[PDB]
Amino acid sequence: VVNDYITDISTKKKLMETKIEDKKHELEAARAELHHWKTLKMPNPDRAK
Amino acid sequence: VVNDYITDISTKKKLMETKIEDKKHELEAARAELHHWKTLKMPNPDRAKDTEAFRLQLLEDGQAFIPFYAAVEFQDDVTEEQKERIESALKQTGILDSLITENALAPTHDRVIRPEPQLLGYTLADYLRPDLEADSLISNKLVDEILRSISLEQEGAGFHVDVDGSYSLGCLVGHAPNEGPSKYIGRSSRKRYQQE
Amino acid sequence: RSISLEQEGAGFHVDVDGSYSLGCLVGHAPNEGPSKYIGRSSRKRYQQE
């Protein structure tokens, strides 16, 4: 019984680590956007490369 | 030791079950996209939500309207490259998705063409032919005149869309970039996007 | 001064309400929110928002 419980807790811990990585990357994308607006020289209308 | 080993193995088993459930979800999403593409009547160029709202309003009210790309087709001898250039220029000008209406409609959040044949210089009528559908309320002659209304040469602040990728409307000159091959003008081109 | 805001016959113009006639074409613009591209105030509002 104790090992069933500890297995469950380990599984949820692993999922928490994975979602921590996910949130780190989402917040890094938000950081990149915030930096871009901080470093905004001017607004760019729709364009092609 | 045996219990610790089995504990770790069971943890990895549960983790793999989570992974397999997620991949089943992704497979279902892919299948949903396949269904959406199968059921779709016809692909459309880029649009704003206001345009879709206006055209739903037109359906509600009952305006005789059709988008340009659905009502036109290239003549066979106009090679695919010229098809791409013309379609790109029309897309930049916004006429590729503009509405041809039997009534002199004034659009709301949309573009409408009207018959004003620019008989001086060449016109898109030289390169394009109508492709109206079975239940189209638009007249073929209207589409032909509108094709004549799209000049291939500019006069002052004139409106023109050349086959070489150059276009203009106003005291201005414009050139189109690459945005993919022709995919909306012509029957085969529309089929190409859905096949992709 | 070259750009007119009233119909030049089968020509080029952009009305005050946002409607426009372009050669044989007549159009009307969609929602785009407060000005963001035109003017220093608009660019600053864009950046800060």
Rounded Cα–Cα distance for residues B96 and B87 (Å): 7
How close does chain B come to C42, measured CA to CA in Å? 22
Q: Tell me the CB-side half-sphere exposure of residue B43, using CA atoms within 13 A.
A: 19
Is C43's CB within 8 Å of A42's CB? yes
Q: Give C38's contacts (C-beta < 8 A, 6+ positions apart).
A: none
Q: Which helix (H) or strand (E) segment is A36 a member of? A: helix A2-38
> Tokens 């206001």 identify what position?
B50
- Return the axis-axis angle of helices B2-39 and A2-38, rounded to nearest 10°: 50
Closest by CA to C12, choosing from B118, B137, B134, B12, is: B118
The answer to whether residues B147 and B153 touch, using CB atoms and an 8 Å cutoff, is no
| 3-state helix/strand/coil string of chain C | CCCCCCCCCCCEEECCCCCEEECCEEECCCCCCCCCCCCHHHHHHHHHC
Cα B180 to Cα B83, B120, B168, B193, distances in angstroms: 11, 31, 21, 10
Residue of A nearest to B92 (CA): A47
Question: How many Cβ atoms are within 10 Å of C18's Cβ, its own excluded?
Answer: 14
Helix (H, G, I), strand (E, B) or coil at B155: coil
What tokens were used for A28? 């890094």
Amino acid at C24: C
Distance CA B27, CA B41 (A): 24
Closest by CA to B185, choosing from B159, B154, B161, B157, is B161
Exposure string for B65-102, b = 16+ CB within 10 A, e = fewer:
bbbbbbbbbbeeebeeebbbbbbbbbbbbbbbbbbbbe
Contacts of A11 in chain B (CB under 8 A): 11, 14-15, 18
Helical ranges in chain B per DSSP H: 2-39, 49-61, 80-93, 140-149, 187-195
Is the CB of residue A11 less than 8 Å from the CB of residue B15?
yes
Instruction: Name the residue among A3, A11, A14 with its Cβ closest to that of B3.
Output: A3
CB contact under 8 A, C24 and B157: no
Determine the Cα–Cα distance for residues A21 and B147; give it in Å rounded to an integer.
Answer: 56
Give the resolution value in Å.
3.5
Rounded to the nearest angstrom, the minimum Cα separation between B155 and chain A is 26
CA neighbor of B130 nearest in space, from B50, B54, B185:
B185
| Of the candidates B171, B177, B181, the residue with the CA atom closest to the CA atom of residue B82 | B181
Q: How was this structure determined?
A: cryo-EM
First to last CA, chain B: 55
Cβ of residue B171 closer than 8 Å to a chain C Cβ: yes
The one-letter amino acid at B101: T
Largest CA distance in chain A: 63
**Which token pair is C15?**
């009305």
Q: Residue B87: name the closest of B79, B95, B75 by CA.
A: B95
Taking every pair of Cα atoms in chain C, the longest distance, rounded to a whole number of angstroms, is 42
What value, to the nearest 5°, has the Cα angle with vertex B125 and ends B73 and B119? 160
- Testing the interface with B: which of A4, A5, A7 to mutate, by most B Cβ within 10 A? A7
Q: In angstroms, what CA-CA distances link A48 with B29, B92, B111, C43?
A: 30, 11, 22, 21
Give B17-21 contacts, CB < 8 A, sequence gap 24+: B18/A11, B18/A15
Check: CB of residue B90 under 8 Å from CB of residue B161: yes
